Structure 1
């Protein structure tokens, strides 16, 4: 919260997060969304058998794809978007150990946390907003602007201060569990692997100074704070 005078290694007042075998430091402050509840009480009824957790595999930080922000981005533009858990299983960081349990269990309840790290320089400026939309299947294209993002659980990133942001995502779905994988033998009547959407949008365009860089980058990291699996099956490759 408070800086110190310069020494051999500059202003050594960083903070950090350690989850399992992964650590992430931050140079400035961090903004965190509220810790909110998931539906509880349906788990013991939707599954006659015990559900499982594998924290050492799922609760570690995993970086996903890099996000490029340029001076040409306009307010409301989608910089990136994720359908979860689907995109974290078959499109981003595919070899991550966090994905292991999804190969053998057919159902699950998931609570996540997403950390966003930005690196714009002191002569740049801009604002980005990241928000989550619960149970978004077939409703991604409405209530999808920066206004809806500012109303739902979200975090804001300033591109010159480089504050970190942590989005806490509870499990809010219209069914007890979300299905983990599609399969040639599984039904096509229910689209699986998606209980929410994460949007990364431009709030105010990135700007730079004379001869400055026309872009900068943001990196998202995810981790399950609570991943419960149900319905064991033979292992299958993801999507």
Structure 2
């Protein structure tokens, strides 16, 4: 709707690059972790460009294009043993810029689109992230010549939070690991420019 108006020139997709699974950094869950504690959080796309999986081919189109619309899919894989137990919740907050420190509890996570991970069964969870932003496009990269009036590379936030603490048996493991994987289901890029390094 807004796509055709916001960009006079046509937008481009690179499915072969962007629509593949890419792992990001490992998450550690311990018995010390309490309910409502942030295990990890991601400002997207920023953190998938210039912190996590920086050498991924998914990031190649972001070098040249200045604008874009982005719909993502995030798979989470846990590996705790059968004598452990616990609950983790992953949720998404749309257009979170200067509103990360409010509506940021386990209760808010249960309200917003989310997935629930049991740490004993090792069930996989897939949360789908549409593009819900107050502008037509999100900016991909900051630059020295570009304005500082608009903060780029953030249309949403992902939170990984403890719902129920990890517990273990006598002489059992005091931690276990979760691995997130991401992919773009619909990444449309706009406004071609000279290639730059990401952040």
Classify the secondary structure of the residue corresponding to 2:191.
Answer: strand
Q: Tell me the CA shift for residue 186 of structure 1.
A: 0.6
TM-score normalised by length of structure 2: 1.00
User: What is the total number of aligned residue pairs between the two structures?
Assistant: 199
CA deviation vs aligned residue, 1:94-147 (integer Å, no higher than 9, x gap): 000000000000000000000000000000000000000000000000000000
Runs of 4+ in 1 over 2 A off after TM superposition: none
Q: Once the 2 structures are TM-superposed, how far is the Cα of residue 238 of structure 1 from its aligned partner? A: 0.2
Secondary structure of 1:150's match? helix
Q: 1:158 aligns with which of 105, 118, 121?
A: 118
Q: Tell me, which stretches of 5 or more residues in structure 2 are unaligned?
A: none
- Any stretches of 5+ residues in structure 1 without a counterpart? 1-40
SS at match of 1:181: coil
Matches of 1:57 and 1:96, distance apart in 2? 9
Compute the displacement of 1:189 (Å): 0.4
Pairwise CA distance, 1:212:
0.5
Between the aligned partners of 1:216 and 1:95, the Cα distance in structure 2 is 27
Deviation at 1:168, TM superposition (A): 0.2
Q: How far does the alpha carbon of each residue in 1:56-99 deviate from its partner, in whole angstroms, 9 at most, with x for none?
A: 00000000000000000000000000000000000000000000
Q: Could you say what secondary structure the match of 2:104 adopts?
A: coil
Distance in 2 (CA, whole Å) between partners of 1:125 and 1:62 is 28
Please give the secondary structure, in 1, of the residue aligned with 2:159: strand
Cα RMSD, aligned residues only? 0.3
CA distance in structure 2 between the partners assigned to 1:45 and 1:72 by the alignment: 52
* Distance in 1 between residues matched to 2:169 and 2:192, nearest whole Å: 56
CA displacement at 1:159 relative to structure 2: 0.2
Q: Mapping of 1:65-214 within 5 angstroms?
A: 65-214=25-174
CA distance in 1, matches of 2:32, 2:192: 48
**Which is higher, the Rg of structure 1 or of structure 2?**
1
Give secondary structure in 1 for the equivalent of 2:47: helix
Q: Which has the higher contact order (CA 8 A, sep 6+)?
A: 2
The Cα offsets for residues 214-237 of structure 1, whole Å up to 9 and x where unpaired, read as 000000000000000000000000
Provide the secondary structure at the position in 2 that maps to 1:168. Answer: strand
